[PDB]
Design a protein around this ligand. Structure first.
Ligand SMILES: Nc1ncnc2c1ncn2[C@@H]1O[C@H](COP(=O)(O)OP(=O)(O)NP(=O)(O)O)[C@@H](O)[C@H]1O
Ligand SMILES: Nc1ncnc2c1ncn2[C@@H]1O[C@H](COP(=O)(O)OP(=O)(O)NP(=O)(O)O)[C@@H](O)[C@H]1O
Ligand SMILES: CC(C)c1ccc(CC(=O)N2CCN(c3ccc(C#N)cn3)CC2)cc1
Ligand SMILES: CC(C)c1ccc(CC(=O)N2CCN(c3ccc(C#N)cn3)CC2)cc1
Ligand SMILES: [Mg+2]
Ligand SMILES: [Mg+2]
Lengths: 352, 352
């Protein structure tokens, strides 16, 4: 049986796969050809079908897991294409997490003799996050922050140490947003959540701009000016609102300038894409800040695939969290952003 | 000099006007004709120009203020039309608040010999709110809640007593959102705010549906089905997420179903209008709940003109705040929702 970990979310399926690299002579002979064929298919291709992608740059090499040396691979594809994955599989013990482990439980059992073990979404997230950080990213730090995020001339990616991680606030930006307070390896709760996450950015941006992919919406947002759509504090006061420390550049009303017909007619798609990203990102950071104050936690780590190849949101979160907390909260990020549930599911394998 | 109070916000100008009803014989003769003309223009018309509206139903009659009996009138018009108001005025001491008191200060001084006194936006809000509640709404309660908001068969408007108001959380839903913790009549702070307020609803709904007015967007939203655009918990899990008490009907990702091209092509404008309202309203209630927990305040009062003629948002806030706090927080509303700053400004008149 191959060692898989699967996180089936609302938008993306994430898969962690452990490739043994210490296969002896007798072990190779005992291999069934279908197992040799699966391992060869996964390691010789980086694109699977039309929508499966292996993130090669995230691979953990020479990892000791369950007493064996191997490489840990990270693979993703849209949940919309899970029926194709299952039909491929019908041509093994599967630890699965995310909402789709329950929604698609009966579909996985169409694969004969397959043993599906459902694991809690946020239980695997914590276990996966603490494991990857503990084994490091091939000797490098798994966690990083943006030093001097208030100054763009100095704002640069710098590694961050989480050797004693607790207490920790985890902000999981997937389709929606889950916010976790991690007090120890076995003591953690879901503080709250918000429904304004990656799916809101993607869904709204698709309505407003007609973009056809997450990467395309990010590309449009990088060329736009969100202030063409948003109403700023200085549009209401003429400048700063000194009494309550609100700078003129702060957004008073997201999309607030779109109440005027002439401004809707002069706004571009790139402006709307950017305003969507800024609106979603600032609201996530603001909610994260409120939970951090309530939980008395000053380390806020952001995960989930809303932030993959999305440096704009990361810098925005880094600047905003630092500015609005007056340097008392630090925005932290992790190289394996969206795969921690898949890893945590894989780690539940010995329990069966 | 007529007694005006003016709150010039980002979207709407609010005006409170005190009409003396105890004018003696000698007082009437000493009246200048322009003062008789202004008083007659305001009390004999309910529509001023093309965009000014007097909310007759809110009028406080036989009010004793500054030692005189009179009626308190409530008038509104768009800030976009303030130049017309000023040009009418150029054909008096003015206490003004809101961001526009600073942005348009030089324009008000084009009226000769006019004395403009700027007052803090949230200072007038608190003073105005506590005053209107103290004098009551013509013998009726100014404050009301929705009893049994969890059950639609019993959900009905019921008056609420605020005779000892403190402590109080005030959630001012204007263009953006301001959240205030009121600890006493002179001790209060702005806890935080969010940029997802009435202007976001109006601005986004205009982009998505082409609606031309706030009332039209509310009319569209009442006919729509927000679940056509939003991704629910049961769309991800297949049902409830029992582990963390998330019901299947809860919104996991606002506009999250708009990532699929076929769902964008079958969604209606009414659905998008409703999803915009639900998204904005739930986020406001969720932020209000987080501030209430942090401030240890269980009375949350919502004001601002996002909720005028908007019972859908009020019931939504009443149900959501009660559900997610398990009955520990009460959503409260006030009949004079958007006029408290204008009233508070009027009350600063003796200080000059
Ligand atoms: N290739 C991609 N396709 C789709 N969305 C992408 C892609 N890359 C990044 N994203 C973003 O990542 C978000 C989903 O991230 P992810 O953490 O995988 O959520 P999820 O687990 O699938 N949904 P959830 O059930 O809430 O956990 C989307 O809403 C997008 O904003
Ligand atoms: N006739 C109307 N015209 C415009 N907006 C309306 C109207 N009726 C209700 N609204 C809503 O009320 C919101 C503005 O309420 P209001 O409390 O007056 O904010 P404001 O003071 O003008 N802006 P702010 O500077 O943030 O205080 C708008 O964003 C709409 O959602
Ligand atoms: C007074 C009226 C006009 C008004 C002004 C401003 C606002 C909005 C507001 O007050 N703010 C914006 C959002 N802010 C953030 C943003 C990101 C992070 C992080 N990480 C934390 N906070 C808080 C302040 C409404 C109405
Ligand atoms: C686990 C993933 C799929 C997920 C589920 C759910 C959510 C959203 C969420 O968790 N919630 C919705 C917003 N909620 C509100 C709404 C109104 C009020 C008030 N007044 C208070 N809370 C909190 C819970 C994200 C990701
Ligand atoms: Mg997920
Ligand atoms: Mg206002």
């Amino acid at each position: 049986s191959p060692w898989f970990g699967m996180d089936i979310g609302g938008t993306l399926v994430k898969l962690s796969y452990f490739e043994p690299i210490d296969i002896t002579a007798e072990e190779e002979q005992e291999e069934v050809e279908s197992l040799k064929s699966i391992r060869k298919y996964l390691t010789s291709n980086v694109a699977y079908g039309s929508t499966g992608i292996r993130d090669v740059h995230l691979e953990l090499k020479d990892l000791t897991l369950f007493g064996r040396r191997g490489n840990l691979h990270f693979i993703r594809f849209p949940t919309q294409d899970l029926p194709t994955f299952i039909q491929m599989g019908r041509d093994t013990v599967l630890c699965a997490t995310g909402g789709g482990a329950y929604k698609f439980e009966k579909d996985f059992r169409t694969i004969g003799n397959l043993h599906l073990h459902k694991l809690d979404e946020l239980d695997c997230l914590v276990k996966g996050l603490l494991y990857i950080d503990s084994v490091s990213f091939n000797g490098q730090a798994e966690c990083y922050y943006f030093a001097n995020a208030s100054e763009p001339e100095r704002c640069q990616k710098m590694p961050f140490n989480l050797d004693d991680p607790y207490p920790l606030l985890v902000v999981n930006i997937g389709s929606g947003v889950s916010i976790l307070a991690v007090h120890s390896k076995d003591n953690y709760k879901r503080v709250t959540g918000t429904s304004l996450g990656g799916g809101t950015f993607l869904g709204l941006c698709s309505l407003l701009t007609g973009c056809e992919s997450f990467e395309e919406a990010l590309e449009m947002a990088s060329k736009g000016d969100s202030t063409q759509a948003d109403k700023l504090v200085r549009d209401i006061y003429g400048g700063d609102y000194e009494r309550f420390g609100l700078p003129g550049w702060a957004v008073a009303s997201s999309f607030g300038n779109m109440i005027y017909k002439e401004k809707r007619e002069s706004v571009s798609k790139e402006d709307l894409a950017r305003a969507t990203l800024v609106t979603i990102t600032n609201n996530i950071g603001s909610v994260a800040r409120m939970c951090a104050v309530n939980e008395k936690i000053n380390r806020v780590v952001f995960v989930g695939n809303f932030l993959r190849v999305n440096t704009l949101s990361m810098k925005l979160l880094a600047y905003a969290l630092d500015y609005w907390s007056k340097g008392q909260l630090k925005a932290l990020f992790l190289e394996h952003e969206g795969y921690f549930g898949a890893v945590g599911a894989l780690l539940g394998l010995p329990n069966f």
